[PDB]
């Protein structure tokens, strides 16, 4: 089996693009599961909702030993996506579709996992409204501002920058981008 590079899509509509790749090509795209020290709720399922960690000290040590591409605290419990969880998907020859922040890109590269980082760049506020038709003007201005700051601060880590007048255009480009950079 050949290693498949993990994927981090960023920018407006990245979550729709993530869901679409998984639902269209389940043979080439997969997901991994985050870790948490929060205790498991009865209905939750270990290895499915989270990898539930019983020792907060254990997770703290692993975070400091760089075992996570992303980690943080909420409601006094730890949360993170582990290097190994990405590696397992990649080793099985599937692109791991990651829903992580841009700071994870550098951590994935430093962990030698060779990510594909794709930035969907809005051309303007109006372009945001073209490609996401379910949001208010305010939400679109917030998305546009976030994308401007994202590009200003993280443009050096992008594998590809994609643009378009509709989500369909962006999605076709995203798929074509992944095929070009994987071969």
């Amino acid at each position: 089996v050949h290693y498949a590079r993990p994927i981090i899509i960023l920018g407006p509509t990245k979550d729709r693009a993530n869901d679409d790749l998984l639902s269209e090509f389940p043979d080439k795209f997969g997901s991994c599961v985050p870790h948490t020290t929060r205790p498991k709720r009865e209905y939750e399922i270990d290895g499915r909702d989270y990898h539930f960690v019983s020792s907060r000290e254990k997770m703290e040590k692993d975070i400091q030993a760089h075992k996570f591409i992303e980690a943080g605290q909420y409601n006094s419990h730890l949360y993170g996506t582990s290097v190994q969880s990405v590696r397992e998907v990649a080793e099985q020859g599937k692109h791991c579709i990651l829903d992580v922040s841009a700071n994870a890109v550098r951590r994935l590269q430093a962990a030698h996992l060779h990510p594909i980082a794709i930035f969907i760049r809005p051309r303007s506020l109006e372009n945001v409204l073209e490609i996401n038709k379910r949001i208010t003007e305010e939400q679109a201005r917030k998305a546009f501002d976030r994308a401007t700051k994202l590009e200003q601060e993280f443009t050096e880590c992008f594998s590809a920058i994609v643009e378009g007048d509709s989500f369909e255009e962006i999605y076709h480009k995203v798929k074509r981008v992944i095929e070009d950079l994987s071969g």
């Binding site: 979550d15 869901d19 997901s31 985050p34 948490t36 929060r38 909702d49 989270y50 992303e70 980690a71 943080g72 605290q73 909420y74 409601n75 419990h77 730890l78 949360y79 993170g80 829903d99 992580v100 922040s101």
Partner: peptide, 14 residues
């Protein structure tokens, strides 16, 4: 497949 707990932990207000 959003995990709201996870997103709050990893996207803290700065």
């Amino acid at each position: 497949a959003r995990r709201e707990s996870y997103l709050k932990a990893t996207q803290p207000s700065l």
